[PDB]
């Protein structure tokens, strides 16, 4: 068979070529390769011209040198999907592809950003917290993270303390500059932990604003995603913040190899299947389907390739790296205190100097309540009387039938 990929590294061609050569021990599995191109149009056209014309089997692609490149997969993504050609993803983590509906053709090797927030459902199980706030953008990403947290806040059906309860989650559009109105808003709230999920630059904006509001002093917590440890924010974030790194993420070649191995296990599961229909019609017979794509995904279901560089890599029900461990970490005076203690849902017992922003060492319960209470009340006769004050500013003082001072406010 012939499997191709559009991968950035030229040397990666020989890399995964050798990967084919190694997987050969478990049947022709010829290799095909192709570089990149900026305007994804030329990309998809090369897709048809070479790899679709080859008309054999599936396909791979990673992030280009473009950092965000959130669009770079899509064209070639559903290009072959037009014939239900199951394709795997490497290095892009944007969550849109998480939808099967508009992409019934797409699996991955890596969890998405919005997936990462699941872990935060646990940080209180070591820091016994119950009260939170949220700051997400206005796009889909935030909405995804939000639904995920919501369902992770599934109420444990009972029959004391019962789970953590969310508070007013807030929104904001990109590029803005007067976001402060929100924070000062939250400033009056009754908790002290925070969660922030956004792009790079926006975070730095927020950092600026918050440091101005002094909302980053003592008795405070932060737990950002990955897109904030980044330097543009590392030029703005306060110390004591906590962040986390997906391990072995930004390393292509190892993932390359794992991919080749998984598809090798797949094809060994393919070499003995029945009703083997035909790869596509060279991007010209554009009516048909290599009517194995469904079964192709279904066999990619449990392709339990037990171990690679990152170790065991098994799938979700959305064709994504389902149990990949990764590292927690701390900013400590521009320094990166690593605590690589999250092996999947396992608890995270490291050993170093956790430093919260205020410089203390206690793990403060982000709680404080005994405040004013902004009370409301409606006018209604024999329970509440409304009266205009005198020109002084207060209202006249009266006395009861006996003559007692009828308290007023």
């Amino acid at each position: 068979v012939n499997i191709g990929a559009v991968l950035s590294t030229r040397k990666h061609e020989q890399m995964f070529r050798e990967a084919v050569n190694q997987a050969n021990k478990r049947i022709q599995l010829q290799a095909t390769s192709v570089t990149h191109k900026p305007n994804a149009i030329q990309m998809a056209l090369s897709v048809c011209e070479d790899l679709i014309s080859s008309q054999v089997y599936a396909i791979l692609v990673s992030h280009p040198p473009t950092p965000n490149d959130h669009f770079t997969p899509t064209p070639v993504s559903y290009t072959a999907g037009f014939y239900r050609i199951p394709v795997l993803g490497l290095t892009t983590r944007m969550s849109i592809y998480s939808d099967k509906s508009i992409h019934l053709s797409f699996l991955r090797t890596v969890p998405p950003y919005s997936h990462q927030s699941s872990v935060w459902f646990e940080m209180m199980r070591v820091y016994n917290w119950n009260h939170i706030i949220l700051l997400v953008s206005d796009d889909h990403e935030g909405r995804a993270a939000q639904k995920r947290l919501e369902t992770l806040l599934e109420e444990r059906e009972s029959k004391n303390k019962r789970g953590p309860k969310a508070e007013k989650v807030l929104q904001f559009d990109p590029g803005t500059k007067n976001v402060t109105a929100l924070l000062m808003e939250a400033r009056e709230l009754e908790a002290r932990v925070i969660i922030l999920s956004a792009s790079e630059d926006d975070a730095a904006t927020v950092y600026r604003a918050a440091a101005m509001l002094d909302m980053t002093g003592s008795g405070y917590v932060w737990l950002v995603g990955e897109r904030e440890i980044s330097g543009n924010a590392l030029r703005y974030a306060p110390d004591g913040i906590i962040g986390l790194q997906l391990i072995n993420g930004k390393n292509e070649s190892a993932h390359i190899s794992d991919a080749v191995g998984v598809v090798a296990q797949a094809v060994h599961e393919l070499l003995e299947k029945e009703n083997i229909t035909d790869p596509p019609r060279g991007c010209v017979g554009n009516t048909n389907i290599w009517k194995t794509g469904p079964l192709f995904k279904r066999v990619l279901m449990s392709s339990k390739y037990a171990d690679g560089v990152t170790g065991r890599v098994e799938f979700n029900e959305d064709g994504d790296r389902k149990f990949a461990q990764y590292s927690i970490m701390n900013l400590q005076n521009r320094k990166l205190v690593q605590v690589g203690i999250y092996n999947g849902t396992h608890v995270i017992p490291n050993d170093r100097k956790i430093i919260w922003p205020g410089g203390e060492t206690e793990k403060p319960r982000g709680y404080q309540m005994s405040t004013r209470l902004k009370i409301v009340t409606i006018h209604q006769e024999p329970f509440v009387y409304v009266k205009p004050t005198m020109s002084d500013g207060t209202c006249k003082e009266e006395f009861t039938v006996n003559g007692d001072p009828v308290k007023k406010v």
Binding site: N39, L45, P75
Partner: protein, 368 residues
């Protein structure tokens, strides 16, 4: 002068172009759409792209009206990607599903015809009232409108100035019922005379078959389904009992010639509105392989004009989806002849019928 390219597939309505061009409002033609037609044999997305930028470079085409013909149409996304490449608008005038899907994207300007899920549901309830049906239930599995559809109809139930009834929403599992006994048992819990169904076309026949067993058949019941399990394709599998009702006037007799008419109308009118705001954008992209941001300078804010446009005595408004805000729909019925006969005409939140009726335990009473 302007470049307004069009295209079809699988038809020869040639004069349907120049004729409708001669029927153009002199107050709206101030941009004189240089109409141009091509007929590919609906073959290759790649071919589509080739031809697209071919004509774009050929006549500085600032917009196209695509036309479709096959029922097999998941392909809007392609054109959406084109919008993601070139900043021109595109009209999915007709065809198969070529005006239905919920392809949702931000920097795009593709627009379908026909109705949404919602306005369909609304006309459904309308005709459900005008014939004094009052009890029903629902059945569906995994289609982008599921938690949409239920919420939409129930949220108009919840303002009941009239009597209604909601028995149950029957959530099912598409293409997973390994044990069909599950449905054989579950579809007993129906008791209403009216059922509404939402699905594919094949599993449709499958469930029709299981219904032939559970007893839900043309005895005294009725069935209505929103024209997106079955259309003017009129390939009725046996399992359909006569009496199916639906509403599919999306492109039934609207007139593909009149279709291209409305297309040219809305686009050139929007061009008029933009040059009226001193905002004529007569600069198309430069090249397909070279449609980069080097040429792309300002985004397509003429959407502030594309949303709503009235001409030739007809108004066409648009939501974020991109369907027409005021479609003209019709209600048809599955006769014994396995033929589709038009019955009713819905328009403007209003209905038009011809029957009063829907054909020994039925009596005729008098009073004073």
């Amino acid at each position: 002068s302007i470049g307004i390219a069009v295209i079809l597939v699988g038809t020869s309505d040639e004069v349907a172009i120049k004729d409708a061009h001669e029927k153009d409002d002199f107050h709206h033609l101030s941009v004189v759409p240089r109409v141009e037609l091509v007929a590919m044999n609906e073959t290759d997305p790649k071919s589509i792209i080739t031809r697209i930028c071919d004509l774009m470079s050929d006549r500085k085409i600032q917009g196209v009206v695509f036309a479709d013909d096959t029922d097999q149409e998941a392909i809007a996304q392609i054109l959406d990607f084109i919008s993601a490449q070139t900043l021109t608008p595109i009209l999915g005038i007709h065809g198969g599903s070529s005006m239905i899907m919920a392809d949702k994207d931000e920097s795009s300007m593709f627009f379908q015809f026909g109705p949404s899920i919602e306005q369909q549901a609304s006309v459904m309830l309308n005709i459900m009232e005008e014939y004094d049906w009052y009890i029903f239930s629902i059945v569906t599995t995994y289609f982008p409108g599921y938690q949409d559809f239920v919420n939409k109809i129930r949220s108009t139930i919840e303002n009941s100035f009239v009597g209604w009834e909601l028995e149950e929403v029957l959530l099912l599992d598409m293409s997973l019922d390994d044990g069909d006994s599950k449905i054989q048992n579950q579809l007993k819990k129906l008791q209403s005379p009216i059922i509404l169904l939402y699905c594919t076309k094949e599993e449709a026949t499958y469930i029709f078959e299981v219904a032939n067993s559970v007893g839900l058949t043309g005895y005294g019941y009725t069935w209505i389904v929103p024209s997106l399990v079955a259309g003017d394709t009129d390939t009725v599998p046996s399992e359909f009992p006569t009496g199916l009702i639906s509403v599919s006037y999306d492109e039934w007799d609207y007139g593909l010639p009149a279709r291209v008419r409305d297309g040219i109308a809305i686009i050139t009118t929007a061009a008029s509105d933009m040059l009226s705001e001193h905002s004529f954008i007569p600069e198309p992209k430069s090249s397909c392989y070279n449609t980069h941001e080097k040429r792309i300078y300002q985004s397509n804010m003429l959407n502030r004009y594309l949303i709503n446009v009235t001409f030739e005595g007809r108004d066409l408004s648009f939501s974020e989806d991109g369907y027409q805000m005021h479609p003209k729909l019709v209600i048809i019925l599955l006769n014994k002849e396995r033929k589709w006969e038009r019955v009713g005409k819905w328009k403007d939140k209003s209905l038009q019928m011809k029957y009063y009726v829907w054909p020994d335990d039925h009596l005729s009473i008098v009073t004073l």
